[PDB]
């Protein structure tokens, strides 16, 4: 085993987390998780290999055929990966959340044999155990962890970050029967620790990521374009994703900063259009680049050696879903600065989203187009704009989607909580202190055909209004 | 420039007479809108000074009462015993907020002097008695809301929910 | 006797160290399995053992069932924040064991190596043991008469020899580890902590969503909190030989196959290790 | 009852003598035991002024003050403005509770009217910039802890602790 | 149709006179009304040639500049320096849109030429410094819209959001 | 670029004259940061002397020595039998590895002659009595960091981890 590449990234305002949804825990510190860069590379690796196999074939193959494909690099239950992900980080030493001291003994008092809420809430500076029952409290404590005013305000002008708080914040609290106090005690600092943790965001996170490979699994059918196909999706990764959570919506976006490499045999042309993002010039250029890497997969004097196999597996349109890049609806804008774009990102994928109340401007429409692409949606007619066959006003025809009749899609898309924003936005920098919004719409399987560049007048419309 | 007035609701019978805005100018603050009671205040770390229901000034962070916001100055002939101060009119800490606020308002408080007599013993007493739920509909809303049992059917909530909605703690002196 | 168990908690928060961590798992997995029915009016009407504290919280009113179910997941985190923070080394004695074995072995006129190497991120030994897999799914090698998570000697003997016979071929590895007709000239102890940081455990969390999935329409996270080995915590282990030779092999092996994985992911920079110290005791 | 008088420390260096009273008795509920402070009340829904600031009331439990509170009375050329009654001392909003008061005190504290004519718009302000840390131990504690450079020969300690647990909302005006 | 043209707001001091007829008639379609500015029509691939103030037509869909709509006449001695056209109600962009529109449209922009010697390059202007945007509402936000002050109370809202939505590029020459 | 010095870490009185700029810049590799020693570079198949004491080639791969890495020269009077060389910053085993190396380095170890007279019978020899500790330190970590008995006064525990931390294979011949 030796090193193949080294790429120094850097992440924009990452929200990682383990075991407790934050970043940070009285254990440990973890701001990248060489877990998730692996799960998110495989799953970038699936994406693009699809977006080729139907540029080139028109056909689609399921996840598990795929990664199954990949073994060779990727691993299985049945094969030990090949590729060895590594995470190195400043301030790699003992770094936990240590809450020294809270004073509560008086809220406690407040909550005598009562059934009352308990909410928390960062008030200038000064946070309140806002008691539900009519009662307010400025709370005083002591912890390493140094909150600034600009994170305190990024979370609160953030109507998504101030949203995914709603669960950090606030515990129901029955003393009806009777408490002690040493219990209570410990009740709230659980609340303040899930409270404070949520703030440890930082920015500007730099890790260099290594990359080992074993030399045992050398080029046995196609071991070597398979890890040339898999560096290249491990680019795209980089380039249109990003770690942590809510990466559909610019945070933990990522930026390349040097990719020094040690074996030019695999990786000369990974390490080619790496560097070519070094430092970008301006927007439509940095378009040009992510559209000659789009389609050096599909295009160029190599695309692919290993299809010809019989391993893979169709999808079977009435049963799954699959995502795959579209190569042209990729509009680019520069922003100037950061945190005020993330905060206007929920104008842009709200219903009542005054940045879609202009772009859209209909009830119902509006709907359905963030019902079909911006993730899973709360729904409470709309499924007339998402037929499969009938009245194609705006082409938003899900696949098996059939009126007043559940089946599999319909399902999906109006109640499966877990399904990920075909709507997404990335941030990415040069070093050289300029930036450019990414946004962008993976192709899902289940969109019957869609008018293409109608959706693309949407999408910039979106992207020059965004900011 | 422009004023508000805070109206006590403790359970005493002492509602019709201590002001005289039973209009305001042309407005109410609080205001139910069939979905319940909206945009009631809360004073904390006052208790109440139960005879001439007024507030009086405690230290403990805990110590809450319930009332409602009106625009006036109460009788005509007061305001020689008041607490009155003007205010971004955002440090109201309200509850049910279904309405708007003018962005600034004077606040007059019903004012008692602490009166330091002995130690003191506050007593939370959520409100009850519902004779005390029919006259706080006679003496209290059926004049201060001239929109009450006159334009909803819905005062059987307004009636009972507020069991719930107000509430006060008692010194017992 | 039930009091045993529903008293286990503050056993493990109060005996800190000086329990028997396998069994007290053991039996407040039966509290972790039985949840609903420790907390119907079943919490031994106590005031530190953290059972009542989930009785205080609500968290839903339209299911009991919910309520119990995401207790007992706040509940599951809380025991291995319980073992992670209480349970810490105190490793005298193991040096006091690897001290008189090495004393031993000198009687034996062996030639010790006294290997300590230091962990650098979370290690995962012995994942499919049992220790906290009634609870976690998870485990650690965990020896229940030290005491202690430990390292066998089985898995480092397996490493070296992936690695010697990698780079001396697959003969001067049956030259030195033996085969089916030779026993090896190289014996392993198993590896104990002898001194950490500031923790020996250490909660961690793993959440597939794709691993054996057809496509997104079935994708959903399933996260699975365990325990890890903390950083910067120190095993130590002993390598004895008789014959000369093979002190060469091992003393370069030594350094190099640390840098890479002694344990379970590797492959995603888990069980990475860092040579803290060698030392080579000849006898004759 | 022993009577006990409420002093802030903000950044502001003017109370020197209004405190009279060493002690009158043997008894500070402050301590300080090369830790920093212990028994440390706080008040809410009270603003501060600049003016030697008395504690101007407001409707707000943000509106927060911290200071301590010492035996005697105040030299009786005040306290007829203040606010003034008494409780069972339990109700005391006291941060880092070392101590166990003996349930009942009088309590004295700079209280101003709430200025009829002006917004009581606050903003928060901590105890820091070194160049006045430096004296406002000067202001408020050396004339109450004689001991202070005898004992706590040590700065920083005792200094970087009034910082981290003492602030207040302000008024700024 | 009912008439208009358009104009920019830069931090620019070229933004005295560049129209005649301001209301021509009773409506407007950038109305106001608590929110701000509403229906901002945007315009993109072109940038702004501030001194000398026009807009320069770049072709480069990064670059932007987001003025108002006026109902009107630019001195009615144009079509030398401006660019005329009526639109099918939707080819329009706008910011926070209102509602339906007049099917009928007729904009003048105030535009320059190119004089292509120098190696022109665009840059990013933000609203800033709310002193000049002061002097914006009191020079292009008073006489425009003095219904402002008349029927809403909010001239802060205007500022802020005047602050935060309108950007645009320029030239640097 | 950024060359660098590794200074071993012998028991004999070789660390008086070796180097001219003992200074570097602003990032040394060997740290001392309130955590004890980092990034310690261990090197294999040597063996320092103390008679003139420096590395002899060797090939038993149990041979080992360990030492700090600085910034700096072999003193300009060497180099003509020294070891320069460069390595790609991932091929450097480093003990106690805090953060990254730069991507690319210049490492001066002293690199004596193979001595071809004598014969080689390296010793295993470590660090102790306390005294032969405390003199190098005050030798080394005093004078290449800045931040020895000015940064750090718990020093000690970097006293009683060098003892154990740094060891090599010597010959005494």
């Given at each position: 085993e030796e090193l193949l590449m080294s790429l120094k990234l850097k992440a924009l305002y990452p929200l990682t987390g383990g075991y407790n949804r934050h970043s940070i825990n009285p254990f440990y510190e973890e701001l990248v998780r060489p877990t998730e860069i692996k799960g998110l590379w495989r799953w970038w690796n699936r994406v693009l290999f699809n977006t080729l196999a139907y540029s080139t074939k028109g056909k689609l193959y399921t996840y598990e055929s795929i990664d199954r494909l990949f073994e060779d690099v990727f691993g299985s239950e049945n094969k030990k990966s090949a590729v060895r992900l590594e995470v190195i980080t400043d301030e790699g030493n003992d770094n936990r959340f240590e809450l020294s001291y809270v004073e509560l003994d008086k809220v406690?008092?407040?909550?005598?044999?009562?059934?009352?809420?308990?909410?928390?809430?960062?008030?200038?500076?000064?946070?309140?155990?806002?008691?539900?029952?009519?009662?307010?409290?400025?709370?005083?404590?002591?912890?390493?962890?140094?909150?600034?005013?600009?994170?305190?305000?990024?979370?609160?002008?953030?109507?998504?970050?101030?949203?995914?708080?709603?669960?950090?914040?606030?515990?129901?609290?029955?003393?009806?029967?009777?408490?002690?106090?040493?219990?209570?005690?410990e009740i709230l600092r659980d609340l303040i620790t899930n409270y404070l943790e949520y703030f440890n965001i930082k920015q500007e996170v730099t890790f260099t990521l290594n990359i080992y490979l074993d030399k045992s699994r050398e080029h046995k059918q196609n071991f070597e374009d398979k890890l040339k196909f898999a560096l290249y999706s491990l680019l795209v990764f980089i380039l249109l994703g990003g770690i942590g959570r809510k990466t559909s919506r610019g945070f933990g976006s990522l930026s390349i900063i040097d990719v020094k490499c040690y074996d030019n045999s695999i990786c000369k042309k990974i390490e080619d259009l790496a560097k070519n993002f070094l430092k970008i010039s301006s927007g439509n250029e940095l378009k040009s680049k992510i559209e000659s890497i789009l389609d050096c997969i599909k295009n160029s004097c190599i695309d692919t050696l290993y299809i010809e196999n019989n391993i893979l597996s169709e999808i079977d349109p009435k049963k799954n879903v699959v995502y795959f890049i579209n190569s042209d609806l990729f509009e680019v804008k520069r922003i100037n600065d950061k945190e005020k774009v993330l905060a206007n990102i929920y104008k842009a994928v709200s219903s009542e989203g005054c940045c879609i109340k202009s772009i859209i401007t209909d009830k119902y429409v509006r709907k359905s187009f963030l019902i079909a692409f911006g993730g899973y949606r709360k729904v409470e007619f709309i499924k007339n704009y998402l037929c499969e066959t009938c009245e194609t006003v705006s082409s938003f025809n899900i696949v098996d989607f059939l009126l007043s009749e559940g089946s599999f899609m319909s399902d999906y898309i109006l109640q499966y909580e877990h399904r990920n924003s075909l709507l997404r936005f990335k941030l990415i920098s040069d070093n050289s202190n300029n930036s450019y919004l990414i946004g962008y719409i993976l192709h899902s399987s289940y969109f019957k055909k869609i008018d293409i560049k109608y959706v693309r007048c949407i999408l910039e419309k979106l992207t020059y209004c965004v900011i | 420039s422009t004023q508000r007035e805070y109206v006590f609701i403790p359970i005493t019978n002492s509602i019709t007479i201590d002001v005289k805005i039973t209009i305001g100018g042309s407005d109410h603050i609080t205001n139910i809108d069939e979905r319940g009671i909206h945009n009631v205040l809360v004073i904390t770390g006052y208790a109440?000074?139960?005879?001439?229901?007024?507030?009086?000034?405690?230290?403990?962070?805990?110590?809450?009462?319930?009332?409602?916001?009106?625009?006036?100055?109460?009788?005509?002939?007061?305001?020689?015993?008041?607490?009155?101060?003007?205010?971004?009119?955002?440090?109201?800490?309200?509850?049910?907020?279904?309405?708007?606020?003018?962005?600034?308002?004077?606040?007059?408080?019903?004012?008692?002097?602490?009166?330091?007599?002995?130690?003191?013993?506050?007593?939370?007493?959520?409100?009850?008695?519902?004779?005390?739920?029919?006259?706080?509909?006679?003496?209290?809303?059926?004049?201060?809301?001239?929109?009450?049992?006159?334009?909803?059917?819905?005062?059987?909530?307004?009636?009972?929910?507020?069991?719930?909605?107000?509430?006060?703690?008692?010194?017992?002196? | 006797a039930i009091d045993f168990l529903v008293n286990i908690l503050e056993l493990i928060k109060e005996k800190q160290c000086n329990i028997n961590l396998f069994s007290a798992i053991s039996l407040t997995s039966i509290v972790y399995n039985n949840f609903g029915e420790f907390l119907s009016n079943n919490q031994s009407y106590s005031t530190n053992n953290p059972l009542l504290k989930y009785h205080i919280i609500i968290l839903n009113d339209k299911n009991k069932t919910k309520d119990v179910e995401e207790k007992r997941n706040i509940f599951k985190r809380e025991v291995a924040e319980l073992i992670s923070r209480n349970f810490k080394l105190d490793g005298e004695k193991v040096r006091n064991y690897f001290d008189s074995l090495k004393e031993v072995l000198k009687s034996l006129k062996y030639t010790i190596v006294d290997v300590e190497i230091t962990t650098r991120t979370r290690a995962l030994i012995g994942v499919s043991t049992s220790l906290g897999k009634l609870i976690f799914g998870s485990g650690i090698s965990f020896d229940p008469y030290m005491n202690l998570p430990y390292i066998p000697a089985s898995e480092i003997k397996g490493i070296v020899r992936s690695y010697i016979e990698g780079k001396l071929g697959e003969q001067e590895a049956e030259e030195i580890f033996g085969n089916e007709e030779r026993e090896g000239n190289v014996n392993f102890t198993d590896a104990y902590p002898t001194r950490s940081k500031d923790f020996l455990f250490v909660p961690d969390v793993i959440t597939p969503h794709y691993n054996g999935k057809k496509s997104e329409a079935d994708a959903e996270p399933r996260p699975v909190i365990h325990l890890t080995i903390a950083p910067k915590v120190t095993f130590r282990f002993l390598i004895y030989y008789k014959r000369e030779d093979v002190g060469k092999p091992i003393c370069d092996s030594m350094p190099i196959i640390l840098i890479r994985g002694l344990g379970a992911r590797s492959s995603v920079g888990y069980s990475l290790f860092e040579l803290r110290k060698i030392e080579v005791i000849k006898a004759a």
């Open positions: 406690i008092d407040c909550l005598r044999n009562y059934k009352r809420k308990v909410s928390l809430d960062f008030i200038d500076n000064t946070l309140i155990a806002e008691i539900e029952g009519s009662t307010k409290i400025p709370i005083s404590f002591k912890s390493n962890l140094d909150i600034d005013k600009i994170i305190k305000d990024l979370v609160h002008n953030n109507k998504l970050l101030s949203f995914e708080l709603l669960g950090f914040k606030s515990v129901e609290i029955d003393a009806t029967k009777i408490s002690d106090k040493k219990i209570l005690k | 109440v000074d139960e005879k001439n229901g007024r507030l009086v000034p405690t230290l403990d962070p805990c110590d809450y009462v319930k009332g409602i916001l009106v625009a006036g100055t109460p009788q005509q002939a007061q305001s020689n015993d008041f607490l009155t101060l003007k205010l971004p009119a955002n440090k109201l800490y309200l509850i049910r907020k279904k309405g708007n606020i003018s962005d600034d308002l004077k606040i007059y408080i019903p004012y008692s002097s602490p009166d330091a007599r002995n130690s003191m013993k506050t007593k939370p007493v959520s409100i009850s008695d519902d004779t005390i739920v029919n006259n706080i509909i006679k003496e209290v809303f059926d004049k201060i809301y001239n929109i009450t049992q006159k334009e909803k059917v819905k005062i059987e909530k307004v009636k009972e929910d507020i069991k719930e909605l107000f509430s006060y703690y008692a010194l017992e002196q | -």
